[PDB]
């Protein structure tokens, strides 16, 4: 038991760091979805002007 | 917003200038219809006058 507690603690911390990578990834995933939609709408301006 | 703004302004100026240019020349059409259907009625009852 006193060694399984150590295994659980280290694996939980690594799971949290894996969630860190995942959540930071999803975070700028959102922002870059956002910025590319920015450029798309910037020229959808010309789309709808000329359409 | 400004993209679909210029979209909308052109899209409605479309159905606008359509009826507009149609109005221009349907109007000058009736203008000469006027000058003409004038000389129609003007002398129908010039002979029928006599």
Residues B4-43: b if buried by 16+ CB within 10 A, e if exposed: bebbeeeeeeeeeeeeeeeeeeeeeeeeeeeeeeeeeeee
Resolution in A: 9.8
CA B28 – CA B47 distance, rounded (Å): 29
Give ∠ CA B15-B21-B22 in degrees, rounded to 5: 85
CA distance A3 to A14: 17
Note the residue count of chain B. Answer: 50
State whether residue A13 sits within 8 Å of chain B by CB. Answer: no
Give how far the C-alpha of residue B26 lies from the chain's centroid of Cα atoms, to the nearest Å: 2
Query: CB contact, 8 Å: A37 with chain B?
Result: no
Q: Who contacts B6 (Cβ-Cβ below 8 Å, separation ≥6)?
A: A45, A48, A49
Q: What angle in degrees, to the nearest 10, is found between the helix axes of A4-50 and B2-47?
A: 20
Approach to solving: cryo-EM
Min distance A26 CA to chain B CA atoms (Å): 27
Q: Which residues of A touch B11 (CB under 8 A)?
A: 48, 51
CB contact under 8 A, B7 and A41: no
């Amino acid at each position: 038991l006193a060694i399984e507690i150590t295994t659980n603690s280290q694996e939980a911390a690594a799971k949290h760091e894996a969630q860190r990578l995942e959540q930071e990834a999803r975070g700028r995933l959102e922002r870059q979805k956002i910025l590319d939609q920015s450029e798309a709408e910037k020229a959808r301006k010309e789309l709808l002007e000329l359409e | 917003a400004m993209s679909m703004a210029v979209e909308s302004t052109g899209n409605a100026k479309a159905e606008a200038e359509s009826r507009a240019e149609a109005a221009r020349i349907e109007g000058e059409g009736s203008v000469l219809q006027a000058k003409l259907k004038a000389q129609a009625l003007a002398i129908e009852t010039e002979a029928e006058l006599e």
